[PDB]
């Protein structure tokens, strides 16, 4: 449900159930019904677009993704709740909030459509501020290679035969320009050509042209190594309901961690190179990163986990000691 381009601004507006989604030179606007009358909320284009980009790029995963303290999605599996104010203490207390459930490909397609439309040539929602231009003003082009970015899923490990590429066709990021580009030496014995596999992971991450977007690099059954390059701020504040393990590989990241309900800060965690950290399941997080830093995320891709912290079996935090 996309309107024609509006006359002044040039951005279409969108329908998504009882949600209408709009944008001007400064704000993304979301509109919705409750106790009678029309409700609204504004979000700076640059924030909204970055938050929506992550949501789409993460396939919605499973868990809460918060745009601000009013807007966010619940990422149910094949369904996705989009709430406005629901997980906001005073707003439902007011009864002015609104949730609506959706089939994931619908919301996915729509967000992808909004992202195509509201993101100009000058902006890059995958980028850090110093990397891209502004998200402000009337419609002005599309940014093609945000659009033109194929994702190829790792099945065993990058570099391999029937699986995702390395990135030797990607420029080294400014802020990793001091990271060695040398590749491991492989000396296959005679009659074993191509049987041994190794690559430079730090080289691989040095050429990451996105920020805050874990990509799988090693599959050991369910055990996933999904590293990413982190700069500025996590565009959302999110939290899956599985236990994940963070491992800092370079530079540092400050993590804000709070109770997935009200928001109660529970911890402020600062990871420096080499730090290992469990992010429990009953908390949502958001991180800060001055220098572009290399972060290993360690996920467990078994399918019954996020309906298992629910059951009494499994606690939010991984280890008693």
């Amino acid at each position: 449900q996309a309107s024609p381009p509006h006359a002044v601004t040039g951005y279409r507006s969108f329908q998504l159930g009882a949600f209408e989604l709009s944008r001007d030179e400064y704000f993304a606007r979301i509109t919705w019904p409750a106790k009678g009358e029309t409700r609204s909320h504004l979000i700076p284009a640059d924030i909204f677009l970055r938050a929506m980009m992550r949501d789409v790029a993460w396939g919605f995963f499973y868990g809460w993704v918060n745009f601000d303290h009013v807007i966010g999605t619940r990422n149910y599996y094949g369904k996705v709740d989009l709430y406005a104010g629901t997980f906001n203490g005073t707003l439902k207390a007011a009864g002015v909030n609104y949730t609506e459930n959706f089939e994931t490909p619908l919301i996915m397609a729509t967000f992808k459509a909004i992202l195509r439309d509201w993101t100009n040539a000058t902006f890059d929602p995958f980028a850090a501020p110093e990397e891209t231009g502004s998200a402000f003003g009337r419609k002005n082009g599309e940014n093609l290679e945000c659009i033109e970015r194929f994702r190829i899923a790792t099945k065993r490990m990058p570099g391999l035969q029937d699986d995702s590429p390395l990135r030797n066709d990607l420029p080294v990021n400014r802020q990793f320009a001091d990271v060695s580009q040398d590749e491991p030496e492989v000396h296959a014995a005679e009659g074993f050509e191509g049987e041994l596999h190794a690559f430079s992971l730090f080289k691989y991450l040095s050429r990451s042209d996105v920020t805050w977007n874990p990509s799988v690099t090693s599959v050991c059954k369910a055990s996933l190594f999904c590293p990413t390059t982190e700069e500025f701020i996590l565009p959302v504040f999110h939290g899956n309901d599985r236990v994940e393990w963070f491992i800092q590989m370079s530079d540092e990241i400050v993590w804000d961690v709070g109770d997935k309900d009200d928001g109660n800060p529970r911890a402020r965690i600062t990871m420096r190179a080499g730090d290992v950290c469990a992010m429990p399941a009953d908390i949502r997080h958001q991180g800060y990163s001055t220098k572009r830093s290399m972060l290993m995320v360690w996920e467990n891709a078994t399918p019954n986990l996020p309906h298992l912290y629910e059951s009494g079996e499994l606690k939010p935090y991984p280890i008693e000691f």
Partner: protein, 160 residues
Amino acid sequence: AVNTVFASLDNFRKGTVEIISGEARHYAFSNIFEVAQNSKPYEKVVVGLNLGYVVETLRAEGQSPWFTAAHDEFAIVMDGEVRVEFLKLDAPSKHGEGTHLAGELPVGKPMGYVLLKRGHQCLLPAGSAYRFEASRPGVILQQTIKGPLSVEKWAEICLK
């Protein structure tokens, strides 16, 4: 100028958990280079435990036993340099999980070797035996399942 900061065994800085509420234990906070400094060579120290799956931190110093696993495994060299030697086992372990001693001499033709410097990763194929060679002490991360060789010592590596 840009400076990317990697830690090493002779040069690292543990972070911090400032607790506003709850307990630091629940986050299982450790630093590998501290762990790797403080453990016997190729002692497989679990630093991350997810429902059976594990991340081990090994101190790469000298030469290791022959390891083998029924499934794929991965090593990343976090510091220094490791030579990974590979044997194609004649009779690979079909069944089981985790890391396993391939015995003092396994039965297999030599596949060759891989040379991993800091930030290099490497597949440790199912049904091979592999072995590590480090001249000077390094650090190794191994993505695997909790095996008979996995050491847990949370109380001595974690912020409590």
